[PDB]
Amino acid sequence: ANSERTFIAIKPDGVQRGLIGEIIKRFEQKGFRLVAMKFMRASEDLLKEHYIDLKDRPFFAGLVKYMHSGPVVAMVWEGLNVVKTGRVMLGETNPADSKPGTIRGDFCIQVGRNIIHGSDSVESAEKEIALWFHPEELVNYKSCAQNWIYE
Amino acid sequence: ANSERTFIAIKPDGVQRGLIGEIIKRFEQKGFRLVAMKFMRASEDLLKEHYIDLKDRPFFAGLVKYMHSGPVVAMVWEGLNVVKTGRVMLGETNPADSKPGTIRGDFCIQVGRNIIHGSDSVESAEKEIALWFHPEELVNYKSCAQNWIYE
Amino acid sequence: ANSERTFIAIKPDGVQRGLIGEIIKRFEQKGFRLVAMKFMRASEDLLKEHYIDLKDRPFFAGLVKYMHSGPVVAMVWEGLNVVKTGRVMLGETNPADSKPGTIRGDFCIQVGRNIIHGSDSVESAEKEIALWFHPEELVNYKSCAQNWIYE
Amino acid sequence: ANSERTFIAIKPDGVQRGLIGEIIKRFEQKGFRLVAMKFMRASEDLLKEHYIDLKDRPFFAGLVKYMHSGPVVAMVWEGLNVVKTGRVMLGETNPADSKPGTIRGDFCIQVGRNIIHGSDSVESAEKEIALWFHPEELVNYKSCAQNWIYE
Amino acid sequence: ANSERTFIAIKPDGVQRGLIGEIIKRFEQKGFRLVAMKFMRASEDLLKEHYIDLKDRPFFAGLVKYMHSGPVVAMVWEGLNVVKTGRVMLGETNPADSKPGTIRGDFCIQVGRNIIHGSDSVESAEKEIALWFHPEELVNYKSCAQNWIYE
Amino acid sequence: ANSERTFIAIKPDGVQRGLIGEIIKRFEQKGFRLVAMKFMRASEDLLKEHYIDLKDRPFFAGLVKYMHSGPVVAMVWEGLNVVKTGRVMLGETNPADSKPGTIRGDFCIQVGRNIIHGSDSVESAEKEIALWFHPEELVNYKSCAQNWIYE
Numbered sequence: 001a002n003s004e005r006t007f008i009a010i011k012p013d014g015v016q017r018g019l020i021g022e023i024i025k026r027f028e029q030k031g032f033r034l035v036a037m038k039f040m041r042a043s044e045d046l047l048k049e050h051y052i053d054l055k056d057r058p059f060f061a062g063l064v065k066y067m068h069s070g071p072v073v074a075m076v077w078e079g080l081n082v083v084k085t086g087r088v089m090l091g092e093t094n095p096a097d098s099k100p101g102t103i104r105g106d107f108c109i110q111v112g113r114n115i116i117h118g119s120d121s122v123e124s125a126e127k128e129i130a131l132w133f134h135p136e137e138l139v140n141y142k143s144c145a146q147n148w149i150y151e
Numbered sequence: 152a153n154s155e156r157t158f159i160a161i162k163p164d165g166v167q168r169g170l171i172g173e174i175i176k177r178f179e180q181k182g183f184r185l186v187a188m189k190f191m192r193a194s195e196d197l198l199k200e201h202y203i204d205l206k207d208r209p210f211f212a213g214l215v216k217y218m219h220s221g222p223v224v225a226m227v228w229e230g231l232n233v234v235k236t237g238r239v240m241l242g243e244t245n246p247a248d249s250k251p252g253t254i255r256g257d258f259c260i261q262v263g264r265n266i267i268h269g270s271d272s273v274e275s276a277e278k279e280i281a282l283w284f285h286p287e288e289l290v291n292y293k294s295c296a297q298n299w300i301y302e
Numbered sequence: 303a304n305s306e307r308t309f310i311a312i313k314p315d316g317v318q319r320g321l322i323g324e325i326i327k328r329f330e331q332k333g334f335r336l337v338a339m340k341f342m343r344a345s346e347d348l349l350k351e352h353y354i355d356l357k358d359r360p361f362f363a364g365l366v367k368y369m370h371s372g373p374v375v376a377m378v379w380e381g382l383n384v385v386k387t388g389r390v391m392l393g394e395t396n397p398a399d400s401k402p403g404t405i406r407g408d409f410c411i412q413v414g415r416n417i418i419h420g421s422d423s424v425e426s427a428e429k430e431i432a433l434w435f436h437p438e439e440l441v442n443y444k445s446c447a448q449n450w451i452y453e
Numbered sequence: 454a455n456s457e458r459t460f461i462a463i464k465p466d467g468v469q470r471g472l473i474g475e476i477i478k479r480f481e482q483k484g485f486r487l488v489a490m491k492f493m494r495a496s497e498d499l500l501k502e503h504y505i506d507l508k509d510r511p512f513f514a515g516l517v518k519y520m521h522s523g524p525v526v527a528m529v530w531e532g533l534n535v536v537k538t539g540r541v542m543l544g545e546t547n548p549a550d551s552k553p554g555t556i557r558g559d560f561c562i563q564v565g566r567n568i569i570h571g572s573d574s575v576e577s578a579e580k581e582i583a584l585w586f587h588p589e590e591l592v593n594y595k596s597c598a599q600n601w602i603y604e
Numbered sequence: 605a606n607s608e609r610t611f612i613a614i615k616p617d618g619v620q621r622g623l624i625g626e627i628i629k630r631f632e633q634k635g636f637r638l639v640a641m642k643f644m645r646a647s648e649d650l651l652k653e654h655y656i657d658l659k660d661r662p663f664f665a666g667l668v669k670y671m672h673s674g675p676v677v678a679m680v681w682e683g684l685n686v687v688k689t690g691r692v693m694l695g696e697t698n699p700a701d702s703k704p705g706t707i708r709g710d711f712c713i714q715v716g717r718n719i720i721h722g723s724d725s726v727e728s729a730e731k732e733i734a735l736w737f738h739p740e741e742l743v744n745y746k747s748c749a750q751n752w753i754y755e
Numbered sequence: 756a757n758s759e760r761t762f763i764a765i766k767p768d769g770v771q772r773g774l775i776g777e778i779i780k781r782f783e784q785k786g787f788r789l790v791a792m793k794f795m796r797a798s799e800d801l802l803k804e805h806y807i808d809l810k811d812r813p814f815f816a817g818l819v820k821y822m823h824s825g826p827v828v829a830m831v832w833e834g835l836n837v838v839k840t841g842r843v844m845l846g847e848t849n850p851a852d853s854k855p856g857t858i859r860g861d862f863c864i865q866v867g868r869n870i871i872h873g874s875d876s877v878e879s880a881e882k883e884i885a886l887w888f889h890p891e892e893l894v895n896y897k898s899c900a901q902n903w904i905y906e
């Protein structure tokens with residue numbers, strides 16, 4: 001449970017606006033373990049499979065267009081309930097309901113524009129991960145504060 | 152509604168406790184547009200002009216007085232929904248009902264000493280706008296990353 | 303009640319994990335006054351004395367042994383509502399239930415490691431307060447801004 | 454001397470790249486007073502005037518145009534040695550030479566865009582203040598902490 | 605010489621204009637360990653017995669006075685060379701010639717209100733230590749990150 | 756020269772001590788471009804090859820192993836003068852000679868644990884880039900603020 005993982009990617013806006021050091025910031029202070037991460041451009045292919053379940057809903061292609069227009073940071077975070085906790089850490093997908101203190105609350109205003117992405121479920125989490133990252137990609141180490149964070 | 156504007160002014164107590172950089176930075180990083188700004192001391196008739204609705208109310212002149220005791224930072228901000236979002240940002244007029252994360256929540260204790268104020272309505276917005284500034288103090292320009300905030 | 307005081311100790315985990323400054327600051331910038339502060343390793347007897355009402359819980363022994371593992375930072379903070387406002391500042395006891403922007407909410411994850419302690423109640427405040435420090439360790443001073451803070 | 458002042462302007466670039474709040478807080482937390490401050494599109498004549506010691510510089514006119522490009526933030530700050538100290542604040546003129554800690558060190562890279570301008574002599578100082586600001590635009594007040602800053 | 609401890613005291617001005625947090629934080633983040641710490645109003649003799657080496661000098665009793673005008677934060681920190689570095693950390697005694705990025709650089713203006721003090725030597729540092737704390741107030745623990753600090 | 760590039764890697768020690776968002780963040784506000792990054796553990800022979808030179812120097816062996824003991828953040832950054840400006844932002848190889856305001860200065864103390872590495876030549880830059888990156892791993896975009904960062 002304490003090993004639960006999630007997939008975090010900072011969208012193209014986040015990277016254009018200078019948010020990566022910030023965003024990351026928030027996860028490492030939270031006490032979470034950066035399992036993996038890589039900066040890159042997403043292929044249309046990728047995205048669509050990513051967003052496969054969305055395939056239909058109007059924004060879709062724009063969405064794909066957009067994810068495609070710039071680089072992103074893809075990463076994987078490990079921890080107790082990272083999935084649900086980080087979700088929270090990020091705010092409501094529509095920045096307008098995100099409160100302050102949260103990724104989107106603090107940093108942004110429009111949904112299309114929401115600078116970041118998080119796995120809504122541990123499933124989404126697994127698929128997502130595996131889809132983004134080969135397995136040997138995903139590092140395994142122990143944080144010194146482990147036993148400070150973890151009971 | 153992406154042009155929306157509200158009247159944000161930091162109170163002499165924000166001013167005095169050294170909360171201006173912080174506060175504008177809030178707006179800055181959420182991506183709203185600073186339209187106008189001017190550090191000034193306020194006229195009693197202007198306040199008065201402004202605090203108009205609370206005209207009597209037991210705190211009324213205690214207020215006015217206070218609001219007049221120091222210089223303030225008057226500003227105009229713009230963005231999709233800034234009025235409402237701003238509010239949010241600010242917190243709950245009553246700093247005890249303001250959650251951490253938000254300005255008041257973050258840095259102040261009582262409602263008398265509330266560090267800032269914000270248009271609570273659009274119509275409201277403008278009036279204060281019109282009221283506090285001369286339609287020529289309002290700079291029309293675009294953000295460099297507007298395309299990153301807006302689709 | 304602007305001289306309500308409260309007791310806040312920064313557990314061994316908040317120590318080991320460097321949040322001694324982050325934590326204090328929050329206090330400082332809100333508008334509280336630090337009253338007494340001390341860095342020590344609480345004895346067990348102290349410990350038990352402390353956490354007396356949970357004398358019964360399954361985790362009790364547990365509590366106490368970690369709380370004695372390392373140094374803590376005890377402190378008295380006074381201000382208007384200190385007590386109850388210091389807790390919203392803290393967030394949920396269970397770092398998972400605790401929003402962003404709060405201390406827990408932002409820097410920790412398990413309730414067995416939830417880095418800070420806050421009095422829940424004025425009398426507990428009282429109680430702890432006394433249980434932790436002799437009467438004359440509590441410094442008395444006024445704040446220069448105190449009247450920027452308080453009306 | 455501790456009532457010496459200097460003229461602080463934030464370049465359109467500082468305005469573009471959101472460093473308003475940040476640069477402001479720099480002063481605030483250093484211990485300087487905000488005498489005055491407003492957001493404006495400077496004019497070309499003001500400009501030329503404002504930058505006459507440079508009337509015969511390859512850049513000039515480019516220097517103009519650029520500064521005329523967007524709005525800026527004009528500010529006057531007072532304090533003991535504001536003028537000079539303010540300048541170490543800034544860093545060098547050429548961001549390349551600017552140490553980290555400084556405003557130019559920290560946020561910028563090129564001379565042709567170095568977000569900020571500091572007065573370099575008290576004369577220059579008042580000269581510019583003169584030039585920019587309407588005496589009635591200069592704030593008379595006292596920090597609740599003046600005591601705490603000054604001996 | 606990694607268990608070299610130095611005495612760092614934040615002055616009435618530190619305490620007054622909220623930099624106790626900020627201050628403790630810088631030391632945190634550089635990886636020194638907080639051995640002892642206590643919020644206490646000094647005692648004229650102690651002040652005396654301390655600033656004994658500048659018994660005569662202009663200031664002196666000006667110094668003593670001030671340093672007792674409020675409480676102070678007493679601290680002991682450990683780390684390889686903490687002293688020298690602490691100093692460095694601190695700034696040049698004189699707010700005047702202290703670079704940005706140092707304690708003083710960033711938050712203070714005159715040598716009269718120099719928000720904190722730190723040992724300037726070992727020999728010194730001990731004398732102060734002895735002098736401001738009883739032995740048992742000296743917290744020995746092992747930081748987790750320590751071997752991440754030290755090879 | 757606006758396209759120069761450097762190799763920045765954050766060492767395991769910096770990763771163990773949550774200083775990644777901070778480290779990146781330093782690069783991002785200055786306004787330098789993130790060109791490639793990935794999280795990962797380095798291969799012995801990746802490392803021996805990277806420190807190839809000081810193949811002899813006593814430290815070599817310990818260096819290796821250390822570097823190998825946990826994951827790193829490997830990056831590439833582009834901007835006018837990134838290589839030189841990038842070192843200056845890092846500071847002195849020896850944290851002890853590092854100034855406050857700099858990454859090491861601020862964040863670490865012993866050479867052996869210096870948390871990060873920056874390209875010392877532009878050759879080295881390009882060389883180090885090789886070793887470490889597959890050319891296709893070099894993303895290419897244009898920051899929306901470049902024109903504000905550069906003339």
Ligand SMILES: Nc1nc2c(ncn2[C@@H]2O[C@H](COP(=O)(O)OP(=O)(O)O)[C@@H](O)[C@H]2O)c(=O)[nH]1
Binds near residue numbers: 093
């Ligand atoms: N432009 C635009 N994008 C949207 C809209 N609704 C959702 N999206 C995008 O689709 C992403 C994923 O949709 P959803 O899963 O429902 O949110 P997520 O689970 O947080 O990924 C959101 O984060 C948005 O960036 C919309 O109405 N307009």
Ligand SMILES: Nc1nc2c(ncn2[C@@H]2O[C@H](COP(=O)(O)OP(=O)(O)O)[C@@H](O)[C@H]2O)c(=O)[nH]1
Binds near residue numbers: 270271
């Ligand atoms: N002393 C005092 N001032 C108050 C009280 N309620 C409101 N105010 C002040 O009057 C301001 C305006 O209140 P309100 O109309 O609720 O907010 P606005 O419409 O956003 O300015 C508040 O932000 C406070 O500064 C009160 O109970 N006591």
Ligand SMILES: Nc1nc2c(ncn2[C@@H]2O[C@H](COP(=O)(O)OP(=O)(O)O)[C@@H](O)[C@H]2O)c(=O)[nH]1
Binds near residue numbers: 394395416418
């Ligand atoms: N391991 C563990 N510790 C707990 C649990 N519930 C509470 N505690 C711990 O003991 C302290 C006292 O608990 P409680 O009275 O609920 O929390 P409070 O409202 O923060 O003081 C908490 O701050 C926790 O560190 C639990 O279910 N398990």
Ligand SMILES: Nc1nc2c(ncn2[C@@H]2O[C@H](COP(=O)(O)OP(=O)(O)O)[C@@H](O)[C@H]2O)c(=O)[nH]1
Binds near residue numbers: 512564565
């Ligand atoms: N393009 C360009 N602008 C320069 C150069 N030198 C100075 N300036 C610009 O004109 C301003 C005024 O120059 P000067 O008075 O030396 O510098 P200041 O008084 O230190 O900051 C600088 O802040 C730059 O923006 C140069 O070589 N090229």
Ligand SMILES: Nc1nc2c(ncn2[C@@H]2O[C@H](COP(=O)(O)OP(=O)(O)O)[C@@H](O)[C@H]2O)c(=O)[nH]1
Binds near residue numbers: 715718721722
């Ligand atoms: N008012 C005043 N205080 C001074 C002066 N020089 C030094 N002091 C004070 O005395 C303290 C100690 O003297 P010194 O050893 O020279 O300071 P250090 O370098 O902290 O140890 C300083 O921190 C100052 O607050 C001076 O010219 N005027």
Ligand SMILES: Nc1nc2c(ncn2[C@@H]2O[C@H](COP(=O)(O)OP(=O)(O)O)[C@@H](O)[C@H]2O)c(=O)[nH]1
Binds near residue numbers: 848866869875
């Ligand atoms: N233990 C130890 N490590 C050192 C020493 N000198 C350098 N190193 C380590 O090896 C690295 C590379 O040294 P060097 O090539 O001179 O520095 P670079 O090329 O400027 O950054 C540094 O990051 C240090 O951690 C030393 O004297 N002792």
